[PDB]
Amino acid sequence: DPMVSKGEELFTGVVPILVELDGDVNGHKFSVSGEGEGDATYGKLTLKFICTTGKLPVPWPTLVTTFLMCFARYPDHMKQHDFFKSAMPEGYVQERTIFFKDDGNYKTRAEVKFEGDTLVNRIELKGIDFKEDGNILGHKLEYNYNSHNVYIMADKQKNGIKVNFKIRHNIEDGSVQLADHYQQNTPIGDGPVLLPDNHYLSYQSALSKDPNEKRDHMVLLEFVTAAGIT
């Protein structure tokens, strides 16, 4: 397939990744930069993020979903369903609203595209109506992360996709903080893209720290695999 060849070919080895995020949650402002690499053949992403403005005023786990679905491994039989690579190299817009149960919400806009050989994710995040002393601004979330499926459907009329899923973040008391994600993606170019049948991505994420790093930071290792079309 002369299309499936194009974006495919852009992802066949290890691709450098740059992430930049500008954030404001209840007027607490911050910036983060990330670097690493993705290897879509294996669905493998390796990233390190740094808060460049000082102390991150939200828990790192809350930003994992915000900080690259073009790196998903699509099985050969499901390659006609890979919208994210098909939008490349011109890229796509990824928008979300993240509703923290009994707390505030995040609204994000990102552009994901190539700059030369580097895959870049540029993000603006606004949070509002957070509780001062709640789980997010009160930093009551454990530094860990659960496996989760991400459901994708076509949104034909916007020439893109809609994605929906729930994240449960472990609270330090043994409870959980739900984060209800609503997502839309649409290509930046006017060229054709693959519009998928309903399917899902399986994510596994592992959080860690760099023992030599004094800045406020997070190391993220993610595996992501498309499924749900036999």
Angstrom resolution of this structure = 1.5
Number of other residues whose CB lies within 10 A of the CB of residue 59 = 20
Distance CA 13, CA 92 (A): 21
Would you kindly state where each structural domain of the chain is located, as residue ranges?
Answer: 1-230
Q: Is the peptide bond before 61 cis (omega within 30 degrees of 0)?
A: no
Determine phi and psi for 157, rounding to 5 degrees: -70, -15
Closest CA to 18 of 123, 125, 124, 121: 121
CATH fold of the domain at 1-230: Green Fluorescent Protein (2.40.155)
Residue that is written with structure tokens 């609503």 in the block: 182
Q: Using the 8-state DSSP alphabet, how is residue 171 labeled?
A: B
Cα dihedral 182→26→213→178 (10° resolution): -40
Residue 147, judged by CB atoms within 10 A of its CB (0-12, 13-18, 19+), counts as exposed
Closest CA to 10 of 126, 118, 128: 118
Give the pair of three-digit tokens for residue 224. Answer: 């992501």
The b/e string for 175-197 (b: 16+ C-beta within 10 A; e otherwise) is ebbebebebbbbbeeeeebbbbe
Which experimental approach was used here? Answer: X-ray
Distance CA 59, CA 23 (A): 13
Distance CA 125, CA 102 (A): 19
